[model samples]
Target chain A: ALYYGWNDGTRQSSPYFLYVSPKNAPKRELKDEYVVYCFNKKLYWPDQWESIYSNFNDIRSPYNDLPVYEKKLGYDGIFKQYAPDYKKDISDIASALVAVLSNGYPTNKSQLSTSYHLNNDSSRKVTQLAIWYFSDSLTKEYLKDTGGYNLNDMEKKALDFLISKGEDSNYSLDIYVYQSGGHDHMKDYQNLLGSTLIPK
Target chain B: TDPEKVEMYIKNLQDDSSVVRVTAATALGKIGDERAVEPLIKALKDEDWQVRVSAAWALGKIGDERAVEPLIKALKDEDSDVRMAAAKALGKIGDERAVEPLIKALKDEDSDVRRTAAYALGEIGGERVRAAMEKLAETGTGFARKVAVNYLETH
Candidate 1:
């Protein structure tokens, strides 16, 4: 069970939980009511996919993490106001799965209060720093937009800002070295770093 | 008739289709009686793909791992589906014996085959899987990388 809870205990909504895992996940482990496996990506849970997408069961990305226009981003957007049209092809944003899981992989908004999560951890700041540290042009905008949010909410906004800017790049999360759960790995992206540059 | 009914079903191992015999070979597995093991071992040579696949699947579902060694041969069956199904069953049965063949299947021609191999390793859910599949499942995107990220997270 993936439980969404607030570490602070005061402002955090109800602890949401779900029986979400692939068929291959150890069934015995499901008995642990309080356990949550913090996944770096989607678990491809068959039922979860069905609930979100109208025509489901197939689990291929749309086009290897292409930029997601509204015609591409098949699900809802930030604040639940934006939703894709039924005729649209689902976008291939891998991190959407990460964000979706935090939200409890909910079918709709009502369940969001129960099972979905908005994670608050030290790593949250690390995610912001990772984005700002690597992002060239948008880093300024991200740092600026973060001022709109409180300390707790700033991390989330920065992350959303990075994800939105990435959508312009077509959600091409294949920009692997820059960000991942193990953002520390980004320390080694030699090409993106200052090594040696020459004239064209 | 419950005991007799099961015994009669077990006797159907002599039936016409290798499929039925294969089913019969593994039906005794559900019975959990040790007497079923030898027959299941014999059905290992069953000609039909379904029969072989069924036998392998049943052994895995039953959880008695004496069938481990015999199922290894099933891993090399001509049909990829049968081989994959047997690989899956062996993984669920959780015997370390099948690990080597499963590792080799990591290079399988089919993506479905490779995906199943990744899955079975996770089901094994041991340090060995964590060590070995982590090595084979290279980190990246496109088809392999995305799933590799998903797999490493689960195991």
Candidate 2:
């Protein structure tokens, strides 16, 4: 299921189903528009991020190719997905950070000059534990690397390599790029997850 | 939000003052879910650029996919803030439907819009995401280029 479904049209907590075909990913252009950020075979984006798109009509499905993408994108059309953008980005620049959408990830958050990553089983739980070890370093790196425009193909190659490493238990990297912003300076991210994570 | 509050907020989103509409949209973010989805989406098309921006942020905070198509439109909203908010909200919602529009955002006239579009693509990562990220990475310069590279590294 790529997009959630609801007969009531309430749009929250409704019985979300998946979208993969015109029956599911009805919005061809919408799906084609998103950038694939992160995917863990064991975890779906929903398990990580809050309410992202699913099947057909799922606005994120570009090219109307959900059927083909469901399997290739991740595990069971439900791999853990993450996208990292926004300059001046840092999940742990302050102290403890937690969340898929916020500054937290597979491991490590930023505080003063360090970021933390949990050495544990890959699950939503470990995602939050990453907040325990924070550093400004990750924040700096995250922001620094993202603060510009007009890159070359080599830069793209390097970045693709960078995100690939995040999937490895052996490593994780922190990057920051500072930039001129109309409002990029106002980077206020609040941690929001309404569940208890088992940290051990 | 109560039915009345929801109604009032919805009405406020339509206010003549761009500032007030932006503020009302901000208030709706806390409400999360329900009618705000369409209002925020339509707001993405608002004549006033600031209203377009506030609406995108509101939709993102709401975290619903119904706003996916409309929010994707936000990626093209003339103002950078509005475009970024649309991309970010679409990311928060994880709508696969937004992939193409976001791809278009990467080429927006405003370099900031392009930057935010790249950021949103990274946030919405999946299988084909690398292709999108790669496309965006190729277009960035200086720190923006570096940041895209780093996002590719960590996320």
Candidate 3:
């Protein structure tokens, strides 16, 4: 299933909304359906969801003037649905998103401010998104070598969409893909699609 | 700590005033010098209970096995605070020898002493200590029960 959702990056700096579906599913397949999951349970139905995404316009926008799912999934429920492997991938992506928004990613250089506007509104903006592929077997040489292994299709598609969104909205987007864990080099990181590969 | 500062603090442990002795004991503990262990152990016999408490605390921070017997002896100190400090020090030292005395201290009249003893037993874990902490978690007072529960959960 293709998992995606929106979170408010203007006021609160953490991800709150998430969804999962088939990669090839139509944009309007579950448009009015109550499928969007809010991590924070306090946010009420259509009212609060509408208030946050009212100005956001996209095929996947939740501002369709319809009620969203009232049932929120706790961590346990999320794990049960995503299973152990998928849960780890989601968690890594969530961690990467947090690193981007807070500029907390492991880096020695200065980072751009983690702020973006949604639908031309100065006070509200679409939340940041992150997609990461973690492999303990990945090596620094393989990443630096231009002829070496490239990002898989899944990662490429996600980044392409985010890059397009940034250009369309004139948003300053920062994306990084690096070799971590056993292969972390702690040296210079090469950028691909405004991205970088560094050891952490 | 510098050797000079260590020597100065070691000398201050013998000061006539109990206040100077207490400060010296705490300072030596923070320095964590093995050289201060012997002098700090002697300070446990000071006439002032506060000085004895400081000595027990310092010895624990140093984490020397030599302090174990002295700290175990301190578990029977006349003052509850001294006993509590000794129990805490013994726990930090993590000597198997202290498990029995600490188990006995679980029944100390002072609630604080009993709680510290329970915590110490948890730190120096064994079949017997775990059984004792389980009892404390079930039958001890509110705060002691909480401490025992926390240790049992984490350990």
Candidate 4:
């Protein structure tokens, strides 16, 4: 149930349930141009599961390879899911998408300064993906000894997808770069949730 | 509040101007003096909903058990905002007397009221609260279900 129903007519709830396709996600058929919510399991929440929601225009289905145009870019304050810009440089979009996914992973929240991980059961399958950036030549050596710079197969594929799209849009992809939760802030966030740029 | 300020605020509650009355109520609430409980309870029935709401807010902040019945009545106020404030104040009070009233509030027409009731029950935590959350988790409406899921599971 990757896809959830999209509400194009007079947006109600801002984009929290916008997109999060997990094993338990409910299925919804794509309709006329509206904000479609979904979850892509390919995305990781570090060692756990996480979901991603974006404008239908910005997201492409892993299974069908089609974009839901009805869904437009919106804000959750946690992640700034950039509005789809067939017009903006793809390189920027790739980096932005990478940054967006990283922010949603296990335990991390909207706050960049703080994050937490809550878990005790170790028997559960731990699937994790990570991304790192190199600012310059000597940067690689800094992490080489610690082995924190290595990219796993899943990371490679994820980055590869972004890079491919970046190239298709005529910009080379350089994966390293980007940019978590103060639930306290969302208490009054009712006014800020829907339709930053596109309707529905 | 100091005895002197409490006296002044109580006087202001009858200052003829609604703003003064409202401000006095808010001041008493923030001061959180038990002395203000009775006056604030009276304000709950003020002609102006703002005064009533602020009085409810102050009563909750004061945490006096005496305000429980009045705050419960405010839950059915004409204005949703006042009802919300009343619900919130009741939560802050945390007296079991509010439990049954809050349970009835779970079905409030306004989602905000329902969410507040669920949240207040979570704060009042016990068998009844747990039972309320379980019932909502199992059979509540969309907003109720989400509130129960979040209020019980998270905070």
Q: Which candidate ranks first by DockQ, i.e. highest?
A: 2
- Per candidate, native contacts kept equal 0.00, 0.00, 0.00, 0.00
* Model 1 CA deviation exceeding 4 Å by range: A1-200, B1-3, B137-149, B153-155
> What does candidate 1's lDDT look like per residue over A1-200, in tens digits?
12111011121211112222222222212222222221111011011222233222333453111111111122224211221111122243333333332322121223322332333332233233333222211222223321112234544444554345434332211111112111112121111111011112
TM-score of chain B for predicted candidate 4: 0.87
Task: Write the number of the candidate with greater DockQ, choosing between 1 and 4.
Answer: 4
Off by over 4 Å in 3: A1-200, B131-155
After TM-score superposition, what is the CA distance of residue B87 in candidate 2 from its true location, in Å?
1.7
lDDT of 2 by residue, A1-200 (tens): 22321111121211111212223434322231121221211112221111344433443323222112222221111111121211123333221222331333222223211322222112222332222112111221111121122234433333232332322211122111111111211222111121122232
Model 3, B6-110: lDDT tens digits are 999999988997667877887888789999999999999999766787888888889999999989899998876689889988999998889878877877766
Give the Å error, residue B111, model 1.
3.5
DockQ of prediction 2: 0.02
Residues B1-155 of candidate 2: C-alpha lDDT, one tens digit per residue? 57788778899987886657766776677677578878877777788655665677677777877777777655665555466667767777777677778776655654445666666767778866766556558975655456557767876
Model 2 misplaced regions, further than 4 Å:
A1-200, B131-155
Model 4, B1-155: lDDT tens digits are: 38999999998998887657877887897788888888888888899666776788778778899999888899999876578778887888888778878887888866556767777777787777777767878877776676678767764
The lDDT values for all models are 0.41, 0.43, 0.50, 0.47
- The first chain of model 3 has a TM-score of 0.21
Q: Model 1: per-residue lDDT, tens digit, B1-155?
A: 25774676567766895545655755665565655555656666677554565566666656678888777777777765557667777777887767767777666654445666666766776777666656556643354444556767764
Clash pairs, model 3 backbone:
A2-A21, A118-A125
